[PDB]
Amino acid sequence: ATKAVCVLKGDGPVQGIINFEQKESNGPVKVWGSIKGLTEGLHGFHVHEFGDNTAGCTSAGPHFNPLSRKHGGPKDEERHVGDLGNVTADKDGVADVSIEDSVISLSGDHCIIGRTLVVHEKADDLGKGGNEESTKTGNAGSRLACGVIGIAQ
Amino acid sequence: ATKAVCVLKGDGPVQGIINFEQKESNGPVKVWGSIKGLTEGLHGFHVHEFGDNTAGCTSAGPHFNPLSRKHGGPKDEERHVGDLGNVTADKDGVADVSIEDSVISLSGDHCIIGRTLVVHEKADDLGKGGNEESTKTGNAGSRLACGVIGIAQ
Ligand SMILES: [Cu+]
Ligand SMILES: [Cu+]
Ligand SMILES: [Zn+2]
Ligand SMILES: [Zn+2]
């Protein structure tokens, strides 16, 4: 069924292609692809509200959050729609992303097409950091690369 | 009002920012902004089907055509939904765009969000070129710059 794709680019070396596949209407979405040029280890990874790159990744806005909840990890009921948790880069700085999520969608109210995928400087603390920033952004730091999510075939 | 935005970029100097605004879901869309780095004269300007920039503008596919019609000008009844005609660059290579269109939409089963806006090498002959290429692409030639159309605040 629906497919989407996103090319990640930023001001530094981080870049990559992420694919989205949703076989059934409001079934789970498979998210996979490769991002390079990352530091080894965990990096926050979220869908942000606006597909606006006019000021690089800053104009993407906050995490996509149509239900007005607090930040969390993807396994949590209390999360943003766009909270996809972390991706892990290996010792050569490559993240072979492989996620399945059933809260994002490629259609309807939780649709992420037209919005911005962002990969971050640091790990997402999944809302467990005990400060207000943790339940807003997970303390994942700056936006290293981003791309608008587009319809694919 | 629904709003969208597109940052156009390519392998050459052509780049620009195009805004979209649609006050009513069943009303027209206003399209405006600027593109620079163009030769003076007319340049084809269309929404292509896929918001896939993995091969630059090449992976965007053909003009967005959900109703399976021939290529035309924006004011023709026979047109692709993606056909927005020509933009005009001045002698400084700058095209100031201001279009209103009532066939494209920012919502509904056939909206253009998540698709790719493309500005071309040559003029679009609006499907009146008298050859099979004309009723496919308008003879507008290569794709100089493009971007995925994203949701804006
Ligand atoms: Cu983020
Ligand atoms: Cu085109
Ligand atoms: Zn979040
Ligand atoms: Zn066309």
Curated annotation (Swiss-Prot), chains A, B:
Q: Where is the lipid attached (S-palmitoyl cysteine)?
A: 6
Q: What is the effect of changing residue 134 to N?
A: In ALS1; reduced metal binding; increases tendency to form fibrillar aggregates
**Keywords assigned:** Acetylation, Amyotrophic lateral sclerosis, Antioxidant, Copper, Cytoplasm, Disease variant, Disulfide bond, Lipoprotein, Metal-binding, Neurodegeneration, Nucleus, Oxidoreductase, Palmitate, Phosphoprotein, Ubl conjugation, Zinc
Name the reported effect of residue 85 to R. Answer: In ALS1; ubiquitinated by RNF19A; interferes with zinc-binding; ubiquitinated by MARCHF5; leading to the degradation of mitochondrial SOD1
Name a single GO cellular component.
dense core granule
Mutating residue 80 to A: what's the consequence? Loss of zinc binding and enhanced tendency to form aggregates
Q: Which residues are connected by disulfide bridges in this protein?
A: 57-146
- Tell me the cofactors it needs: Cu cation; Zn(2+)
Name of the featured protein: Superoxide dismutase [Cu-Zn]
Q: Which organism is it from?
A: Homo sapiens (Human)
Recorded name of the encoding gene: SOD1
